[PDB]
Design a binder for these strands. Structure first.
Ligand SMILES: [K+]
Ligand SMILES: [K+]
Ligand SMILES: [K+]
Ligand SMILES: [K+]
Ligand SMILES: [K+]
Ligand SMILES: [K+]
Ligand SMILES: [K+]
Ligand SMILES: [K+]
Ligand SMILES: [K+]
Ligand SMILES: [K+]
Ligand SMILES: [K+]
Ligand SMILES: [K+]
Ligand SMILES: [K+]
Ligand SMILES: [K+]
Ligand SMILES: [Mg+2]
Ligand SMILES: [Mg+2]
Ligand SMILES: [Mg+2]
Ligand SMILES: [Mg+2]
Ligand SMILES: [Mg+2]
Ligand SMILES: [Mg+2]
Ligand SMILES: [Mg+2]
Ligand SMILES: [Mg+2]
Ligand SMILES: [Mg+2]
Ligand SMILES: [Mg+2]
Ligand SMILES: [Mg+2]
Ligand SMILES: [Mg+2]
Ligand SMILES: [Mg+2]
Ligand SMILES: [Mg+2]
Ligand SMILES: [Mg+2]
Ligand SMILES: [Mg+2]
Ligand SMILES: [Mg+2]
Ligand SMILES: [Mg+2]
Ligand SMILES: [Mg+2]
Ligand SMILES: [Mg+2]
Ligand SMILES: [Mg+2]
Ligand SMILES: [Mg+2]
Ligand SMILES: [Mg+2]
Ligand SMILES: [Mg+2]
Ligand SMILES: [Mg+2]
Ligand SMILES: [Mg+2]
Ligand SMILES: [Mg+2]
Ligand SMILES: [Mg+2]
Ligand SMILES: [Mg+2]
Ligand SMILES: [Mg+2]
Ligand SMILES: [Mg+2]
Ligand SMILES: [Mg+2]
Ligand SMILES: [Mg+2]
Ligand SMILES: [Mg+2]
Ligand SMILES: [Mg+2]
Ligand SMILES: [Mg+2]
Ligand SMILES: [Mg+2]
Ligand SMILES: [Mg+2]
Ligand SMILES: [Mg+2]
Ligand SMILES: [Mg+2]
Ligand SMILES: [Mg+2]
Ligand SMILES: [Mg+2]
Ligand SMILES: [Mg+2]
Ligand SMILES: [Mg+2]
Ligand SMILES: [Mg+2]
Ligand SMILES: [Mg+2]
Ligand SMILES: [Mg+2]
Ligand SMILES: [Mg+2]
Ligand SMILES: [Mg+2]
Ligand SMILES: [Mg+2]
Lengths: 144, 118, 65, 9, 146
RNA sequence: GACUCGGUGAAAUUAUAGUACCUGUGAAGAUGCAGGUUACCCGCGACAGGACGGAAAGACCCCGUGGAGCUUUACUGCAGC
RNA sequence: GAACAGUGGUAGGAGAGCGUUCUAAGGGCUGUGAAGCCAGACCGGAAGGACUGGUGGAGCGCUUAGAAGUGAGAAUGCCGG
RNA sequence: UUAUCCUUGGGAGUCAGACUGCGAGUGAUAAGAUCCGUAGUCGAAAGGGAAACAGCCCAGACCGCCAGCUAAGGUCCCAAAG
RNA sequence: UGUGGGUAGGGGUGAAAUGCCAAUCGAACCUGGAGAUAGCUGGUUCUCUCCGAAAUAGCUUUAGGGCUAGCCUCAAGGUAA
RNA sequence: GACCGAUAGUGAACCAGUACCGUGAGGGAAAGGUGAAAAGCACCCCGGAAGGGGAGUGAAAGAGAUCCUGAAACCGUGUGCCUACAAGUAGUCAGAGCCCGUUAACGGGUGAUGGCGUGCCUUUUGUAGAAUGAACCGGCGAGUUACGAUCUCGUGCAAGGUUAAGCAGAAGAUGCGGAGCCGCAGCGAAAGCGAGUCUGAAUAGGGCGCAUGAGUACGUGGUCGUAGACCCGAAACCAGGUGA
C-alpha cells in the first residue's frame, strides 16, 4: 500500500559535529548511534541508511563515572590459544581515544551489513580539529 | 481392473516444483526437497502476514516519534494529547503526514500540545 | 466357514428372554466348611453376566438360540 | 577388526 | 427408471473407508490402530474371551445341567391365533400347518391360553394348557387330544 | 609411490546446504539456536581436532513366556540292555 | 435467509468431498488433429479443474450409476537410470 | 445463574508420561532423583515475554487487512515505547 | 606327493581345535512343509470439516503385551435428571 | 471375461528354463513398437572409418535401425537480472534498482538491503537433534477377499418372513422347488408346565419372563471370527534329496 520508503535517490545526509568534551561515554554514544541510523528523521526506513554523518571531536576528553577509568577493561581475543588481551579504560582514553568511542558506538549500531555501512558515516578525532571543513558540518548539541 | 499409477503422480509433483521456482539449487529441481521448502514457505508466509502488521506499526511509530520530537514532543506525549483532543487519525495516517505533509502533522501536534498544557 | 460356538461357554451360560446371559456362581464346588450358610444360600441361586463381560463374550455364543 | 569391539565387555 | 439416470435410495449405500491412504483422511499411517503392541500387528489381537491370562470368566464358572435326548418341543398356538379361523372349523395340526399358522410341527401342536377365543371350534391338538382347554370349551367348542 | 604433464579412469559415502570462532542454550557435549568475536572471491600441496566421521540394525548388558549347542540325582519319553 | 454462538489439536471416532482404471446407459469430441508430453501471469475452500500455445499422430472426454490391483516421500524397501 | 447429565447400542485409542507450584514418604529435609496426593502447563498448543530455552509468566492460531485497545514484559542505543 | 577309490548330516571323519566335510559347520547344501512363528523393530499412499483422549485402577508366567473399568466418538432414547 | 497390457500378464510377448551362477541337487534373468509400403537414403562433399552436411524417398527422416511417444534425475551451450567486507535449514515478509510485457491481473523475471526463521519422517516425557531412515529421479510397493456373526442405514413383505440343492433358462434375468432356517413364548438342569415358570412345605418372598407386539429376506457401510488376513523381516524346526 502507501507507506513511503526512503531510497538511495531520496536520501540526503547532513554532516554534524558533536563535541565529546565532558560528555559521558555511553550517553554520548547512544545519541550518536541513533543519528547514524537516521532515527531522528521522519523518513527513517529500516532497510536503507537514512542517517547523518557525525564527526566527534575531543574524543580524549570523554568522561566515565565511578571507578570505570581504572576498572572498565576492554578485552579482545586474538584467536590464538591464551590470546586474551586487555586494556583498561584509562589506557584506552589515553592512547586509543578514537577506538574507545568507535567501540562504544559500534556496539550500539545494528550488527549486520547495513549496520557496518552505518558506522562508515562516523569520524572520531582526538583533538579539537577535524579535516572535513569541505563537508560544511553543523554543530549538533546532544539532547538529554 | 488394474489401475496403473499413470499420470496423476507427475502432475501433482510438477505443481510443487512450479511453486519452487527461484529456490536455490536442488530446492527448485528435486521433488522431495522442493516439497519441504514449499511447505515451510507456507508456515513462514502465514507467520509473516501477521508480523507484517506488527512491523508496519513499528515503522509508523518510529516516524511519528521523529516528527513529534521536531515539534518538541515525544511520541508518548503526542499520542496522549491527540487522544485528549479527540483526534482518531491513526498511526499509518500520522506517519504519512510526517513524511508527506509535515505542516499538517505540526497542526495535529500543536493541537496535542494545547491539551497537554491544560 | 461358519463361526464355531465356544463349547465351554455353551456348557455354562444360557440366553434369557430379553437376551441376558444366565450363569451359575463360582465358589459352589467344595470347601463348604469355609463359607457361611448365607453365602452358600446366595451362591446357590443363578446370576446374570455383567455388561463388561457380556460385550467381551457375546460373539462366542452367537449361534445359541 | 577388533578382538571384542567398541565399549567391549 | 433410465439406465443413464439411476439413483440409489437415500441412505442405502455408503462409501467404504480406506485406511492408510494419507494423513488428510484421518486414517493415514497407523490406519486407525494407534502405536505398537499386539493389537496393531498384522494377524494381531488375542483370541475372543481371552483376558491376558486372568482365568477367563467361562472357566471361573461351573458347567450346569444336561441335555435330554428325548426332549419334546411343541409348536405352541395361543388362542388369539385360533380366533382367525372360521366358526365351527375343525382345527387340526395339518390345517394349522397348511394355513401357515405354524411353520414347523416339531413334536406336535400345543394350544396355550394367551388371548381370547370368541369363535366355536373343534380343536384337535396333541396337548392343551389347562387354561386353553377351559377357554376352548367355554367358547362352546371341543378340545380333543390327538 | 606421492607431486607435474600426456593417456585411461573407479570406490565407500551422500536430506538439501551460501557449511567460521568463543561463551552460553538446548534430548543436559552445536557449522546450522542466542549474544558477541572474527572473516574479500576461487583453488593446489599437506595434517587429522570435529562433523558424537565411514564401515557392521552392539558381540557386552537387559528384555522376548525367541532359538540353538551342552549337562544332570529337572520332567516326560524312546533305543539299547 | 436472519440473529446469536463457535471453528488449536496427537491417538482416535464421525462427516463431506477430490482424483485414478474399468463397465452400463445418455450424450459428445477427434486427422479441420485423440491420449500422452512441455510451457504459461487462469479457476475452485482443499484434494483438484480448465483455457491457450507447442510437441504428438489415434484415440478420448462428459453425465448418472456400478465395480475396484484406486492415490507414496520415507519400509538400511525392489528394479532401472 | 449455566447446559449439562443419564441410559442403551456401534467404533476406538490409551495402560513409558514430563516439569512447575503446593502437601507427604524414600534419599543426606541431595539429584533435572524416586514414589504418592493436589492444581497447572507440556504431551496434543502456535502467538508475546523469560537472550537462546516442551513443562515458567502472559495468552488459546477458521481466513484476510500497510486499522485500534490491552496482557506478561517493557520504554538510553542494539530494539517498539519515558 | 600323483592317480583310482571308500565313509554323508539325529551322519561322517578327527595324533581332539568342536576341528574339517566344496571360500558354509556347536550340526553342510538344495528344494519343499512355507506367506513357519515374531506380545518385537520398520513401513502403511488424496483433501477439508465436526468432535477429541490416555499415559490410570484392577487382574494377569504379568510388567515395553492383554483384558474389563476409567477417559474419546457416533447414533438413538430419557429428557432438564 | 466391469482379467493383464511389456517393472504388468506366465519365469518366458523376444530362439527361456536360454544366458549366467553352482561340483551337484539346484537357482535363474534382461530383452516388445521405423514406416501404409523399404519407398531402408542413388549421387555430391569432409573423414582411414565412425559420424556428419547436402541431395533424394516419404505425410513425417528432430520416423534413418541406439528407428512410435519421449517425463524426471543428470550433463551442456547461450544470456535478462544479481554476485569478490561476506556468517547463510537457504525461505518468508518488507524493498529500491534493472529487465520484461501476461489466461490483464491492486502483472512477470531478478533481487542491493532490513525483519523473522534450527529440513522432512520415524520414535519419544522431550528430537534442530550430536537418535532413526532416505544419494537423486522414475516406476513398482501395505486392512483384501471368501464364508460366518453382529450393529447401523436402506428396501420388500409383516405375526410372519424366506427358500437350498436341484430342474428349465444366454455361464443371465426369471419361473419352479417349502426340504430347511429365523421369528411369533417363556421358565426349568430335567421330567415338564405355559403368560407364566423355577426355587420352596408355601395361596410367601425372590429369579427369569409376560403385561409394556416385530420380525424376516436381501443390499451398502462399521466391527468381529476362521482363513497368511495390513505389508516386509528372523534365528530356528521338520521332510525328501545333492555333495569327500
Ligand atoms: K480404530
Ligand atoms: K538428541
Ligand atoms: K579430522
Ligand atoms: K496436445
Ligand atoms: K526408497
Ligand atoms: K506434582
Ligand atoms: K564331529
Ligand atoms: K520376469
Ligand atoms: K532475508
Ligand atoms: K546411533
Ligand atoms: K414369580
Ligand atoms: K425391515
Ligand atoms: K456386515
Ligand atoms: K482382517
Ligand atoms: Mg537483531
Ligand atoms: Mg506409483
Ligand atoms: Mg457339588
Ligand atoms: Mg472412520
Ligand atoms: Mg487423528
Ligand atoms: Mg507418512
Ligand atoms: Mg510405527
Ligand atoms: Mg495399542
Ligand atoms: Mg527445543
Ligand atoms: Mg543446560
Ligand atoms: Mg555447547
Ligand atoms: Mg550435524
Ligand atoms: Mg560412527
Ligand atoms: Mg552422521
Ligand atoms: Mg540393535
Ligand atoms: Mg563372539
Ligand atoms: Mg481458536
Ligand atoms: Mg486412457
Ligand atoms: Mg495400490
Ligand atoms: Mg524412490
Ligand atoms: Mg505419575
Ligand atoms: Mg523426575
Ligand atoms: Mg506421545
Ligand atoms: Mg487442553
Ligand atoms: Mg506453546
Ligand atoms: Mg524469542
Ligand atoms: Mg516439539
Ligand atoms: Mg526506540
Ligand atoms: Mg570350509
Ligand atoms: Mg504350515
Ligand atoms: Mg475442541
Ligand atoms: Mg508403547
Ligand atoms: Mg512383551
Ligand atoms: Mg475399554
Ligand atoms: Mg488396462
Ligand atoms: Mg512402454
Ligand atoms: Mg515379465
Ligand atoms: Mg557349468
Ligand atoms: Mg518429433
Ligand atoms: Mg503410428
Ligand atoms: Mg522415440
Ligand atoms: Mg569490515
Ligand atoms: Mg560487495
Ligand atoms: Mg549466529
Ligand atoms: Mg529417552
Ligand atoms: Mg532404532
Ligand atoms: Mg542414512
Ligand atoms: Mg530336533
Ligand atoms: Mg554321494
Ligand atoms: Mg570320489
Amino acid at each position: 500500500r502507501t507507506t513511503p520508503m526512503a531510497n538511495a535517490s531520496t536520501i540526503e545526509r547532513k554532516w554534524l559535529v558533536v563535541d565529546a568534551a565532558g560528555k559521558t561515554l555511553g550517553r554520548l554514544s547512544s545519541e550518536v548511534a541513533a543519528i547514524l541510523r537516521g532515527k531522528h528523521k521522519p523518513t527513517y526506513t529500516p532497510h536503507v541508511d537514512t542517517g547523518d554523518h557525525v564527526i566527534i571531536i575531543n574524543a580524549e576528553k570523554i568522561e566515565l563515572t565511578g571507578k570505570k577509568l581504572t576498572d572498565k577493561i576492554y578485552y579482545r581475543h586474538t584467536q590464538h590459544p591464551g590470546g586474551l588481551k586487555s586494556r583498561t579504560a584509562l589506557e584506552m582514553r589515553t592512547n586509543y581515544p578514537e577506538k574507545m568511542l568507535e567501540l562504544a558506538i559500534k556496539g550500539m549500531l545494528p550488527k549486520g551489513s547495513l549496520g557496518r555501512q552505518m558506522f562508515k558515516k562516523l569520524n572520531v578525532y582526538r583533538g579539537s580539529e577535524h579535516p572535513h571543513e569541505a563537508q560544511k558540518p553543523e554543530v549538533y548539541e546532544l539532547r538529554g | 481392473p488394474r489401475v496403473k499409477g499413470g499420470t496423476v503422480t507427475r502432475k501433482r509433483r510438477k505443481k510443487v516444483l512450479k511453486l519452487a521456482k527461484g529456490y536455490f539449487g536442488s530446492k527448485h529441481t528435486l521433488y522431495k526437497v522442493a516439497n519441504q521448502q514449499v511447505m515451510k514457505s507456507g508456515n513462514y508466509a502465514f507467520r509473516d502476514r501477521r508480523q507484517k502488521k506488527r512491523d508496519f506499526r513499528k515503522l509508523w511509530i518510529t516516524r511519528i516519534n521523529a516528527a513529534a520530537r521536531m515539534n518538541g514532543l515525544s511520541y508518548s506525549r503526542l499520542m496522549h494529547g491527540l487522544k485528549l483532543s479527540g483526534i482518531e487519525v491513526n498511526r499509518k495516517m500520522l506517519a504519512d503526514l510526517a513524511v508527506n505533509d509535515l505542516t499538517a502533522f505540526n497542526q495535529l501536534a500543536d493541537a496535542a500540545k494545547a491539551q497537554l498544557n491544560k | 466357514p461358519k463361526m464355531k460356538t465356544h463349547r465351554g461357554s455353551a456348557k455354562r451360560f444360557k440366553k434369557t428372554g430379553s437376551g441376558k446371559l444366565k450363569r451359575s456362581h463360582a465358589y459352589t464346588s467344595h470347601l463348604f466348611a469355609n463359607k457361611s450358610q448365607k453365602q452358600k444360600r446366595k451362591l446357590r441361586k443363578s446370576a446374570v453376566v455383567s455388561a463388561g463381560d457380556f460385550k467381551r463374550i457375546k460373539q462366542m455364543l452367537a449361534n445359541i438360540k | 577388526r577388533l578382538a571384542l569391539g567398541d565399549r567391549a565387555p | 427408471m433410465k439406465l443413464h439416470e439411476l439413483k440409489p435410495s437415500e441412505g442405502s449405500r455408503k462409501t467404504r473407508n480406506r485406511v492408510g491412504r494419507g494423513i488428510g483422511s484421518g486414517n493415514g499411517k497407523t490406519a486407525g490402530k494407534g502405536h505398537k503392541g499386539q493389537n496393531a500387528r498384522s494377524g494381531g489381537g488375542v483370541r475372543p474371551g481371552f483376558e491376558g491370562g486372568q482365568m477367563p470368566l467361562f472357566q471361573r464358572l461351573p458347567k450346569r445341567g444336561f441335555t435330554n435326548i428325548n426332549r419334546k418341543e411343541y409348536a405352541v398356538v395361543n388362542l388369539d391365533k385360533l380366533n382367525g379361523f372360521a366358526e365351527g372349523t375343525e382345527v387340526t395340526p395339518e390345517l394349522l400347518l397348511e394355513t401357515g399358522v405354524i411353520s414347523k410341527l416339531n413334536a406336535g401342536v400345543k394350544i396355550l391360553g394367551n388371548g381370547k377365543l370368541e369363535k366355536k371350534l373343534t380343536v384337535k391338538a396333541n396337548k392343551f394348557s389347562a387354561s386353553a382347554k377351559e377357554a376352548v370349551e367355554a367358547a362352546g367348542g371341543t378340545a380333543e387330544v390327538i
